[model samples]
Target: DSTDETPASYNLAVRRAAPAVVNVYNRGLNNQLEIRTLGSGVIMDQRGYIITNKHVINDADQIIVALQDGRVFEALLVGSDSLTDLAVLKINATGGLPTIPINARRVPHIGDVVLAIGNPYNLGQTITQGIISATGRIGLNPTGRQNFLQTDASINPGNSGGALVNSLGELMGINTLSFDKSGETPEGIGFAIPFQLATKIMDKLIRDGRVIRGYIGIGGREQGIVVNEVSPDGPAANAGIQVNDLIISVDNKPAISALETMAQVAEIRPGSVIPVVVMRDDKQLTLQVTIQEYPA
Candidate 1:
C-alpha cells in the first residue's frame, strides 16, 4: 500500500553531487619510509581545481585523487591557507570536472538539515545526514579563525576536507573535524568551516601562491585589551606603546567584539603602520603600530 507520508527523497541530488566528491590520498615520509594517508575533497571547477584541508596535504610529497568511477589521477599542490585550514589542488584531467555551486549570500542556520559526504575509514562514498547545532564559534585557537558550523553529523577521520551540503544540495561547508578527544565514537559533535570563508581563502590562493594575513605585533585580549604584555622590540615597543594601556579602537572604529577587532587587525597590510586609539586611566591616547605578517 502506498502511504501519503512517504519519506522525502533527495536521491537525485545526491546522485549528481556524489560525482564531485573525490578521495584524496597523500604520500609522506614516516620513519624514512613512505606513508600513505587518505582524505576527501570536492571538485570546485571544471579546470580541475579541488578544495581540501591544509592539514590533509601539508607535508605530502605526492597527491592522488580518486574519482567516483574509480579513475585516479595525480594532482599538483597549489597554495594553502593555514589560518583557515584550506588547500587547493590541481589536476590535469582531459575529462571535464564537476562544478560546485557557490552560495555566498546564504548562511546556514541552526537546526538546518545538512548532508556530509566523504569516504570514512577508507569506505567508499559515504553520506550522513544531520542538523546544524551552532555557529560563530571562536577562540578555539590563538591564530586561526574559529567561526565554524557545529553539526551532529557522523564525521570521521577520513572525512576531513569533504563537502557539507545543505538540504537543497548546495555546498555549505567543508567537513574538517569532530570532537572525539576520548578516542571513543563521536556520535553527535562535528564541525566544518563555512563555504563563504573557504571562498575567501580560495581566491587568495589562486591569485597568490600563499595567503598573507594581517597582524599587529602586540597580543592581548580582543576587546578589553589590558596590554598586559607587549612584544619586546616589536611594533608596540618601537611605537612607544607601553603596558597597562587599554586598546579602545582601530582606525576610529570601536573594538567592541573580539572577533571584529581581530578582523580589523587582519585587514591591515603587514609592514604598514596603523593608528591605534587607547585609554590609560580615563585618558585617551593614540599611537601607531607597525603590522607584521602572521607566521602560519
Candidate 2:
C-alpha cells in the first residue's frame, strides 16, 4: 500500500461543496410536528440566505435547515417564484456559515464531470456523480416555458435545491426536477436552473419579494412564432394582431423561438409599450403593444 503514490480521489471537490449543502425539512402539524416533505438547500453566502425549490416548502407550516456542522435553524420564507419554481429562505446564525463556491465566469460544458450533493430520501447527505448530459434543454411541458441545464446525475426525491457543482467545487446550478413517468421509470435524466439564472432570480426575490414578469397574451407555434390565438382584450389583441400572423420581432429583437421570445417579453416591465413586428398577408406591420404583468 505504501507503493501507491498517486491515489485518485474527488475528495477535494466533496470537501469544498458538501459543507454548504443543507437539509431542508418541511414540517406540518399532525398532533405534533411531522415531516411533510424532505428536500435540500444550499447556502449561497455567509449571510445565512439559502435557496431551495418552492415546492419543497409550499405547504410547510414550519421550515427547518440543518447544517453539516450540526447547526439547526428555523428558516423564514423570503419569497417564491412560481415560474422558476425557486424560493429563498433566511436563517439567523451568530457564527459564520459555509457557502458553496461560485465562479460566475465558469461556463458549464456538456460531458464535464459534476457532483450532486443532497439529502435524498431523508437518508442524510449524499453525493451522486455524473456528467452534464446537455445544455439549454427545453421544458417537457411547453406551458412552463422554462429551460434547464440537463444532466445525468441521478437526482432523486429530496435532491431538489441541492448543489450541482463542477469538479473544482464550483456551483453550476440548483437541482430541480427530473423526467419520470408512471408506466416506465426514466433514468439518467435530470435538470437544473443555470447558476446565472438562479442568481438573477435570487436577487430579484431578495429585492422585490417576488418576480414580476411581463405578458403579451398570445399563443403561437414555434416557426417564427406564428400566431395561432390571441387572448381577447389582451395586449396583442388590443394592438390589432390577428391569427396566423407571423411574429417577426419583439421590441426590435428577432423573435425566433417562441419560448425565448416570450422570455424576452418577460424581462420587459409591464405597462411599457414596445414595437411588435408581424408579417400579415405578406405585408410587414409594426404595432405598439403595451406589456402587461403576468397573472398570478
Candidate 3:
C-alpha cells in the first residue's frame, strides 16, 4: 500500500519558506515611456535586507519590492558587485519579516534534487523542479570567477536573483543566468551564484561598499612585460588576467620594469609556483596563474 504521506507533502518545506521570496520591479524613465522590468529576490534578513541580481537594478532610477506577504516598499541599493553580478538592497518597511533560511554553511552536491522559486515573466510566484546538473560551473563570463551552480530547473526571464532551495527549503543558491541551445526554442540548464561566492561579496560590499577583486593586474603594466593579450577561457583568463598588463613582481620580488618582466619570469626556479602581481587598466590583480601550468 502507498504510504499515507503523499509525495506532494514533501514540499511542506517550500510552503513554509515561500513567504520569504519576493518580486522586484525596476523602473527607469526613458524618452518615450517608463521602462519597467520584473525579477525575483529573497529576504536575507528580518530587518529588510534583500539580495538580487545586479543586472536587474542596473541603471534603475527607482526600485520597488513586493513581498510574498501583502507588504510592499521602496528599496535602497545598499551595495553591488559587478564581478560577481550580485546586489544587495534594503527596505525601510517594519520588522519581523520572514526570511528564507540560507544553508550556506552546508554546501550541496551534484545530482541533488532542488527547487527554483521565482516570478517568471511576472506570472506571480512559481517553482520548478530539477536536479543539480553540475557544481562549480564556470567560464560563462569575463570575471573568470566560476562559482555557479548548474540546474535544469527552468530559469528564464524574471527569475534573476530568485531563490534556489534544497529539499528542506533552505536557500542554497541565487538564480541568475541561463544557457540557451542554438535552436529557435530552448529551455532548462540554468545557472546561479552559489551562496559561498554571493555571501563573500556581500561582506566585502558591506565593509568596503565596493569590491576590490584579486590584485594582480586587471588594472595594467607593472613588473616588466607588457602583456600583449589576454584571452577569456583559459585558467589565466578565468583568474582575471588580461592583455596589455605589465607584470611587476613574483611573490614580492620586484621585476626590472614593464619591459623587463618576462626576463624575471623566464629565470624562475624549477617547480616554483607563486603569485604574479600585475597592473591592468589601472587596478592591481594578483592571480595564481599556475606558473607551472601557465599557457604561455
Best by TM-score: 2
lDDT of 2: 0.91
Model 1 ranges off by over 4 Å: 3-6, 29-35, 139-143, 182-186, 271-273
lDDT of each: 0.82, 0.91, 0.74
The per-candidate count of clashes, in order, stands at 0, 0, 23
For candidate 2, write residues 96-130 as lDDT tens digits.
Answer: 99999999999999998999999999889999999
What are the per-residue Cα lDDT tens digits for candidate 3 across 257-290?
5323433443353345578777777777776764
Worst window of 10 by summed lDDT in candidate 2: 138-147
Tens digit of per-residue lDDT, candidate 1, span 189-277: 88898888877778789998998877666767755576778877766788887788898888778878666787877777789877889
Ranking by lDDT: 2, 1, 3
The best candidate by lDDT is: 2
Candidate 1 least-lDDT 10 residues: 136-145
Candidate 3 lDDT at 296 equals: 19
Residue 83's lDDT in candidate 2 = 81
Off by over 4 Å in 3: 1-5, 30-35, 218-296
What's the distance in Å from true for residue 50, model 2? Answer: 0.7
What TM-score, over all chains together, does every model reach? 0.90, 0.95, 0.72
Model 2 spans with C-alpha error above 4 angstroms: none
